[PDB]
Design an enzyme around this catalytic site. Sequence first.
Site, PDB file in Angstrom:
ATOM      1  N   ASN A  59       0.825  -1.199   0.000  1.00  0.00           N
ATOM      2  CA  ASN A  59       0.000   0.000   0.000  1.00  0.00           C
ATOM      3  C   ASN A  59       0.862   1.253   0.000  1.00  0.00           C
ATOM      4  OD1 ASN A  59      -2.259   1.618   0.050  1.00  0.00           O
ATOM      5  ND2 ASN A  59      -3.030   0.885   2.028  1.00  0.00           N
ATOM      6  N   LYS A 100       9.253 -22.031 -32.366  1.00  0.00           N
ATOM      7  CA  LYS A 100       8.408 -21.187 -33.185  1.00  0.00           C
ATOM      8  C   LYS A 100       7.783 -21.994 -34.315  1.00  0.00           C
ATOM      9  CE  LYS A 100       8.719 -17.462 -30.968  1.00  0.00           C
ATOM     10  NZ  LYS A 100       9.620 -16.349 -31.358  1.00  0.00           N
ATOM     11  N   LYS A 157      12.519 -24.644 -24.820  1.00  0.00           N
ATOM     12  CA  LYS A 157      11.588 -23.974 -23.937  1.00  0.00           C
ATOM     13  C   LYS A 157      10.167 -24.168 -24.434  1.00  0.00           C
ATOM     14  CE  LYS A 157      11.168 -19.487 -23.769  1.00  0.00           C
ATOM     15  NZ  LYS A 157       9.728 -19.231 -23.588  1.00  0.00           N
ATOM     16  N   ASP A 211       6.462 -22.372 -24.391  1.00  0.00           N
ATOM     17  CA  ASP A 211       6.193 -20.944 -24.434  1.00  0.00           C
ATOM     18  C   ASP A 211       5.527 -20.456 -23.153  1.00  0.00           C
ATOM     19  OD1 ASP A 211       7.201 -20.505 -27.008  1.00  0.00           O
ATOM     20  OD2 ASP A 211       5.399 -21.408 -27.830  1.00  0.00           O
ATOM     21  N   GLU A 212       5.331 -19.149 -23.090  1.00  0.00           N
ATOM     22  CA  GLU A 212       4.546 -18.551 -22.023  1.00  0.00           C
ATOM     23  C   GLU A 212       3.100 -18.998 -22.104  1.00  0.00           C
ATOM     24  OE1 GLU A 212       4.885 -14.711 -23.287  1.00  0.00           O
ATOM     25  OE2 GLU A 212       6.973 -14.440 -22.663  1.00  0.00           O
ATOM     26  N   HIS A 243      10.260 -18.412 -15.571  1.00  0.00           N
ATOM     27  CA  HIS A 243      10.113 -17.488 -16.675  1.00  0.00           C
ATOM     28  C   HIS A 243       9.582 -16.172 -16.150  1.00  0.00           C
ATOM     29  CE1 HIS A 243       8.810 -15.746 -20.477  1.00  0.00           C
ATOM     30  NE2 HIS A 243       9.517 -16.684 -21.075  1.00  0.00           N
ATOM     31  N   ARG A 244      10.094 -15.070 -16.668  1.00  0.00           N
ATOM     32  CA  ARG A 244       9.661 -13.776 -16.166  1.00  0.00           C
ATOM     33  C   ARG A 244       8.521 -13.202 -17.012  1.00  0.00           C
ATOM     34  NH1 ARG A 244      14.121  -9.198 -16.916  1.00  0.00           N
ATOM     35  NH2 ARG A 244      14.548  -9.280 -19.146  1.00  0.00           N
ATOM     36  N   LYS A 300      21.787  -3.600 -25.605  1.00  0.00           N
ATOM     37  CA  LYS A 300      21.772  -2.700 -24.466  1.00  0.00           C
ATOM     38  C   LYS A 300      23.095  -1.961 -24.373  1.00  0.00           C
ATOM     39  CE  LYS A 300      18.494  -5.136 -21.424  1.00  0.00           C
ATOM     40  NZ  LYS A 300      17.985  -6.200 -22.319  1.00  0.00           N
TER      41      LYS A 300
END
Lengths: 105, 141, 157, 434, 430, 434
Positions: free
Chosen positions: E92, E144, E170, E172-173, E263-264, E303
């Site tokens: 909060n 994919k 992997k 997938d999400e 997984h994020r 990056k």
Amino acid sequence: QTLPKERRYETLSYLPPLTDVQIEKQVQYILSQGYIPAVEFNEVSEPTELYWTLWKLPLFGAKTSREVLAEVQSCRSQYPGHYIRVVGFDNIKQCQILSFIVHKP
Amino acid sequence: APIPPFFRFDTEDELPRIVPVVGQLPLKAEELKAVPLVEEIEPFRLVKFSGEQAWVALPGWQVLLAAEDPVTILATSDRFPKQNQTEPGPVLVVVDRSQREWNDFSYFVVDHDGELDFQWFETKPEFPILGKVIILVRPRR
Amino acid sequence: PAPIPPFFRFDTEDELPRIVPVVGQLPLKAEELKAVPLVEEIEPFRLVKFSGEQAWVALPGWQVLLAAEDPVTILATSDRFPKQNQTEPGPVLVVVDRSQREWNDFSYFVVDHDGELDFQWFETKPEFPILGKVIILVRPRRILDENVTKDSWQIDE
Amino acid sequence: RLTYYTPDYTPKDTDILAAFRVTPQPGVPFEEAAAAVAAESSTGTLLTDLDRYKGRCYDIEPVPGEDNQFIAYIAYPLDLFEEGSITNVLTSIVGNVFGFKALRALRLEDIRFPVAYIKTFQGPPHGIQVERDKLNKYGRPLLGCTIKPKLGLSAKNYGRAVYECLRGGLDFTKDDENINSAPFQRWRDRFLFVADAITKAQAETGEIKGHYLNVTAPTCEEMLKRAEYAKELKQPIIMHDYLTAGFTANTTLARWCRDNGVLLHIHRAMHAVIDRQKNHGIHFRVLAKALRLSGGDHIHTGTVVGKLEGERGITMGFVDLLRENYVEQDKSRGIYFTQDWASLPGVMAVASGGIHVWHMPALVEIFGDDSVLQFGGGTLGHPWGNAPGATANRVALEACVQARNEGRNLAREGNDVIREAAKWSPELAVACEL
Amino acid sequence: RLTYYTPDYTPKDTDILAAFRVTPQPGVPFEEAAAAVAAESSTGDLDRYKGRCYDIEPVPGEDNQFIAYIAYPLDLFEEGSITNVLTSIVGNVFGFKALRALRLEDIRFPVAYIKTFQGPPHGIQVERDKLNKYGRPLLGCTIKPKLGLSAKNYGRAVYECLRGGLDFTKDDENINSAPFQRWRDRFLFVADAITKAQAETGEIKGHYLNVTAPTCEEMLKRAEYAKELKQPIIMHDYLTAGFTANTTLARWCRDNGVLLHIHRAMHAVIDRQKNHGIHFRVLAKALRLSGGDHIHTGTVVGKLEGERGITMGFVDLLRENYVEQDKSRGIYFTQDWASLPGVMAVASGGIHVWHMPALVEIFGDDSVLQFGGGTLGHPWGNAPGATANRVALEACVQARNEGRNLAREGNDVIREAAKWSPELAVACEL
Amino acid sequence: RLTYYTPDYTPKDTDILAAFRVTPQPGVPFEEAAAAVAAESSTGTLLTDLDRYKGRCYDIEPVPGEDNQFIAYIAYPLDLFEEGSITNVLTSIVGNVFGFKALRALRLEDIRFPVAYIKTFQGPPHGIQVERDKLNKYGRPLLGCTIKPKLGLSAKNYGRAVYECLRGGLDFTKDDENINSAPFQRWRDRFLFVADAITKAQAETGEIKGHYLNVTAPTCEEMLKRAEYAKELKQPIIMHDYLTAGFTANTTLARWCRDNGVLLHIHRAMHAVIDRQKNHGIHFRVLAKALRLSGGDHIHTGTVVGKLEGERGITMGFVDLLRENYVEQDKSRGIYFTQDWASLPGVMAVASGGIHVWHMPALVEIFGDDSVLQFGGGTLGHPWGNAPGATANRVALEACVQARNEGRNLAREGNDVIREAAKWSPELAVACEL
């Protein structure tokens, strides 16, 4: 100053004792929303006990008129020792729109 | 007590590409090809010319930095069919002259019979495309 | 249907850069820093112009940098400023404005060094002409070029 | 790309629509970012059929008054997502798409779960109606203290502050966010000394009093042994911080509370990470629809009294999304998609701002009967304690319930019915000044 | 108020420090908002249980923003619960009205409170012992297309990636179960594609079987089935499913020997804005204290120096035992993990063949490298596209195991491995 | 060796310190035996790192007044031991090191479980505070008979002697050491005829009376079916002989009683094998700290009245270790390491010597409010039975509780308040002489 141990009852219990003009003005909210009101009597107001016994009907005669108000005073003369209610009913949402005690023993 | 400052460019929008600017519109088809290309000396993006030069600073984004030859053009918003109720103000038309290839979904820079002009084309015209409009920036309120 | 034009408008949270004129690699001359003109803004985009031969580098909008009057840049190396870490001497862009002539013990100050140009911090007020306090000291990027600046369709993961 | 931007695509009645608020990086045009937020939430950038499982942007609609921002309505098909999984809506829709780098900010404003996909969920355990039928509390917005101080109270001193609030007419009493169990107050003892304080205050005053026992826990085993203990104390209601504990633990406890008759008070802890910025995150009307599909009979919808007209039309937007059966598309009131809930049960909308006595005209007028009004969050209690402090918060309720049920416009005649109820109540008269 | 800002409070070694990044409303002074970000994250019995602020430290290079170090006591929080840290700290406080944007940058779980948690099921060292994969960063496809592939045609694309020397593959999400592909049949036809790709090439092949489910009963019966296919690893989208379902599955994966690939998913709702949210180095600490033997740390290749300093900032936080307070790299508190197991750092951006010299130098041995993220596949398929990403892996590990500087001699060791590999030499350009 | 004796090693705040009392064999120097007790409790005499997991002696401090004896402070690291296992502290520290042959005697005096390692344990099920909140017994040391005779009584005659003691003001009543079950008295019947005698004495006099039902059992299955039956008789408290039954069975019952709300009375049976000799064994302040980390709401700390000043400062040393949050290093009072318990709940300190009426001034002055006072162990009962015998032991309590709460120094004015309470109590006046 403190708060007394006072047993309270239902959804308008934390008020002065409701006189007759107020209940006439109270049910005029119930039946004006298209709702059918009723009278429900019971011996005790228990948290376990969750049904109260219906008085004659959910009475209704017209879109807006004195329907319940005369019937409560007939129930005060019939049962002067029962917790009398006035409850509303909705049929679209299908629950009660009010539940409050007009008379206590 | 030796104590230097070191605040390095360290996030995404930290490559402010020098992009050439031309005069305020209308103009001719000369002064987009007449402006020379930018040759950045890549360790520090050193950009120099000896003639009468003119450019502008943009913060540098993923579309500006990806453009091979972008050149900004001062204009106003009257040229484009905007439906917002915002006022017509100055618009700095970031023209990429590199990707001259026609697309039916993006705005281009087509020199209208010797006048550089910004119009949409649902079909590929005969009039040759001089550049592609990647960005159309607007100033702070 | 007509496609929507890319009408981007500058937000008040995000600061926009300013072009800083540069002079060559060290050593230079004291007259070479003096020949650099003042740079005015051409509203509303900092749309600056010049007629002669000058090399200009835009450097991003920072708090000290955008609140500066005569920003000039001098190319030098890392050793021309003191040692700060384990890294080797490499190339460093300096930014020093011309109109912050002052005495500070923690800040750096460019001066005249017999018609040349250097960097030295000051514990006592000198008789030397300080040609300005440095603004910011930046070295180049170390990235992988083809995806940082040339592709927008990437995700964080 | 621009194979995912089909602007002529009238979306089917079984698609799962989603209205993002895309703030693209400059130079990215609006169609190509809206095709991209339809890209990486599906069928990312032939082995299958693309045209059957792809997300399709179908309308742009630029936000009025602010350039570089639009409302990309994405139309995900039905058979992309899992039956009954609101943690697969979010993994599909807001999973891989906000960190997309051609976008400076992306905000999932609204989402339309179709009638085909609402029916795979459970809804709340108990609606508005079945919650009121279990509690026997009709025609008034229900109540609640919040036990101050939060930290430090042992479990019996905590239950004494519960029993004191639950005497004076209060219906519920909330257990805090940061109270699950802690070395001063374990849950097995906090739940025990609150069940001994409900059945004292329920037996004293004959209403079905309850307490939002906090079953938010480290593991889903420790959560259900924390809820099965509140079942075996015959507690009416538990609570659960559904965004810290997630939607897999919420939907586990949804299915538990329906299968055990416990009411579920969903608390929106950690909601403001994702719904508070106006440009990026997940607007709470997504997270309100997301827990109406998973469990909860109550959800905090915050407050109204500190907000403008436009900031309470949006708050009364998602109060209607979680409480009404059919809600029309009204974007000034915040709702982007017309949402048939397919007779899914409602969720109470809980008012829990810094609110006190003088806000009972406002929060019975704004939030109707189908609500719960918390207290004690910001306002500084009451000078006579909790039981006169709760009777002040209950006489002011039923004065404003009686006034609303007599034609008295509480918007204009509201401060009269607080002042004419402070006469007949000494506990409310001392609360009438602060 | 202003009793919640105690600037002389040197914080105890048992406190749970939190470094917010407050951007207060105009007119709000910095002492009052820092006492307020410590206020409503507590006690909105108060002298011992109070979240108190003890330092301001304004953000250099920017006005109207500062880094309020809050010092929560230990005994406010639940032993073993990271859903009580995020309920207490960031519950909060972000919605407080005198704050334009509040961002939780970093957090210091002490040695006293890390010991209550489980940590990962298996660390770096324990995971690599189970997989028998040493001295190189591991691999991964992401299958994919995402959607549409039936459970066997999905398994055939798993078999095809895992033939070409790819370690993991992997799920997938958004593949949990869906009417084109149910989990019971996805898990069957994948575990039948692993026992062929592990019998073909003898290496321990695995697949991150997605056990993210609507309920925690449907998540463990989705993980108890991947246990009884004798699968080495599962995966879990830990921010849509939450920290109660992840900590449930953490405690399960330690107690059933299954590795966990966290997984994020939905991480970027809550960190991607640089002024408001919960920065991922908090969420990386939050799942090292719940479980995970892997975590996506995105990518380093797209990056700049600061954005990969921060990216290597939390990569050390989720993988190294002790990390010194280095605010330029992003780590705001010296974090002693108290011999807790590490978490892998899974690179999963638009990386391809040519980023192997960088990502064996940047991400060390203790890493997993995913592929197919943004790149346009491989022109010869999957089993050449995985052999390209495995030869170019081990060409960079061969040069690293011979002292060759992979910042400068890195593009040479790809090009001198394209000669002795035909599947690599066609991914050498596209 | 002498790689394990690092005398400059300032120990970390996360080490697990241990202070042995080494009595080495002659010719063994002090550093080389103290490096040896740091040796064979770790890393015994390049396959790993030695310097990270080794026990390090870091101070010697020879015992004053007695040669050939010193206090080897050993500093074991944190990550050598198991999270939550107090049977891995003892397997590591006192496992392989007392039978070491260069040592004539070795006594583990004290041990410092750090804040980092206390948090892996559970503590007591219920503290001082939560035990008093469950029993509703505030501001007095609680009581107990011990049912004599130990052996021979059938389960109902046993429960009659419980009901007789529990009438006259006694709080608890202890089940014996050597009573678990035996062919005259099975546990299923002993627990049944004690639950029928608590709920008779609890309903008679309205206090929450309890009885330490002995759940010490042959197997951990038979122990938990012996405790789950005392749960289903709604018993407040069980008990357990934690050194005969061990620390795996105690920590099992710790975790059970916390997860079932039963109080746990830890009894120190077989403690005197290991804490009674002053030169060798494990001092009870290790075994007091060892069951505060595993379960127990009460532990027998014996008595004070038969001991000297130095032998009760050491006994009030470990009473503070198991009952107070932070205890300073005071070696005259016996404590060798400063011990932060990290808000772990306290344990009651039970007084169970040969004590009677005239010791109520002493054991309310020495042992404070946070205590339990057993009786009947050595003293020969009462001439009028158990219920006047327990009222004698309860009026003498509340006379000494009233006297302590009025400034009356019970050290000096203590025998006055026994004699002036024997006037107003006939049950106490006949107990006033013996």
